[PDB]
């Protein structure tokens, strides 16, 4: 409840520095590939194998699977720099703008640009621009670099927007059986993106494109924490009016998805991390 | 000391029973799966990247990660049934059988047999037959059920040896620079198997075949584990009797490697299982 996980353009040109320079601390310490590998080794860990529901996608542990590795991802920072935390990318106001491309969030002090269209979308500016910072592929190995490529497809050419926003809190169920990309009036599956999809988490990916717009290198692109920051914090507010509307399902779903199940690759339950405040972090704006 | 981890070959009847129940028991609830998927996740996880060394294999933290790995294998098998602990495969002498495949480890009451050449090796026989026990390929997915192929390749015909046990335990040092595949008077590395490969432990996996033959796929086998026990014991055993030998690398290893780094996919480091004893197990040879 001390933490503070401030909008990414509420940062002073210091905070972007400094939490720009931890990141690529953890990268050289080797400590940011293992969530590269943590995020792509859930995906393959299917509840049950035959469905395609797994461990961090596609079903219920999505929220508290991420919001647990976040929090890891933010005690790794802090122990860098006690002063760092997670911001977010608040991207429903960024989709207000008439290029969002030239949101401050894309600044050559933080994330840097969007792909150049002359050197196949390679992220060439910024501080993970190709030269600045390495990446690796699916299968765990070197890869060429950062690449971006905003609003490209047909299906995500915006970004979501605040009523998208507005229209996923409104659902009153967590989840619903049968706890998959077909669960209606679920906020679960709202957030996530399926109903009328791509939208909302789903819709950011396709936006940026580049390794963000395929799940298992996401993580490639720090934008990805900034992104899931704004995914929990729009969980962390439904927990607000819908507090207590706790989590689905509390029992009798697919092993990993319950209320107490460990989410693959840890052991940690979903119930390990329904109130935010207790893993020691708020949002502004709270 | 307490958790007596035994040879197969000394379970009384209810023990191999109660293993395999217990092992039915983490199946269904869904739990051996994270055994499997770990598995296969610390082979993605290249130290540093690009190299061939990975989290759990083809490097120092081979021996404690699985260490670790088989703790957490037992301590889920002791929730389920606390009188239950890990025994261990000791192949070694079964390479002194005539026919090493008629050990009573893969009898109808415990691991099960060979696999049917009529089904392109399926085992259909033991607790893990198909229809009795589901598998998982490198994706995730199904892939129709438990294979093994008892020394088929021309590289592994046999399993190893108890004298290529005794001389890796001669080995003095731990691991060596560069704590890779490569790294010779290594303890580590010979009991990996990779000097004049394959031996020890990678070839126990070529000569079981089937989904331990694949080393992505292993632990679909229960015997991944009572294997990778024997292992464990071996080291253990290396352990006592070269007391100040310690781990190495102790620093400038690749992250990953280095005795106080976390082993992915866990924050558990090579410091915290150093000591096999301190976390709550002996094997029953250390106690005769």
Redesign the interface.
Same mark, same amino acid.
Not at 44 to 50: D, N
């Given at each position: 409840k001390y933490r503070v996980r401030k909008n990414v353009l509420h940062l002073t040109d210091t905070e972007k520095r400094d939490f720009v320079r931890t990141v690529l601390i953890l990268k050289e *310490? /080797?400590?940011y590939?293992?969530y590269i590998?943590?995020h %792509?080794?859930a995906g *393959?860990?299917?509840? $049950?194998? /035959?469905s395609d529901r !797994?461990a961090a996608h596609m079903s219920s542990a999505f929220l508290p699977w991420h919001r647990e590795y976040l929090l890891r991802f933010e005690r790794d920072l802090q122990s860098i720099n006690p002063e760092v935390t997670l911001p977010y990318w608040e991207w429903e106001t960024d989709a207000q703008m008439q290029d969002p491309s030239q949101s401050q969030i894309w600044s050559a002090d933080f994330m840097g640009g969007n792909g150049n269209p002359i050197k196949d979308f390679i992220v060439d500016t910024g501080p993970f621009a190709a030269g600045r910072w390495?990446t690796?592929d699916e299968?765990? !190995? $070197?890869s060429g670099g950062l690449k971006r490529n905003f609003g490209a497809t047909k299906e995500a050419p915006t970004l979501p927007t605040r009523d998208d926003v507005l229209n996923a809190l409104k659902i009153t169920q967590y989840d619903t059986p049968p706890w998959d990309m077909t669960s209606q009036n679920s906020f679960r599956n709202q957030l996530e993106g399926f109903i009328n999809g791509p939208q909302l988490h789903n819709r950011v990916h396709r936006w940026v494109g580049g390794q963000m717009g395929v799940v298992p290198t996401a993580p490639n692109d720090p934008v990805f924490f900034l992104h899931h920051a704004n995914v929990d914090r729009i969980w962390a507010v439904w927990q607000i009016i819908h507090r207590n509307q706790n989590y689905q399902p509390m029992k009798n779903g $697919?092993? %990993?998805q319950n209320f107490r199940?460990?989410m693959? $690759?840890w052991n940690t339950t979903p119930e390990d991390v329904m109130n935010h405040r207790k893993l020691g972090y708020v949002y502004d704006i709270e």
């Open positions: *310490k /080797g400590i590939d293992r590998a943590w %792509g080794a *393959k860990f299917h509840t $049950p194998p /035959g !797994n390495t690796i299968q765990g !190995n $070197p $697919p092993f %990993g199940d460990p693959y $690759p």
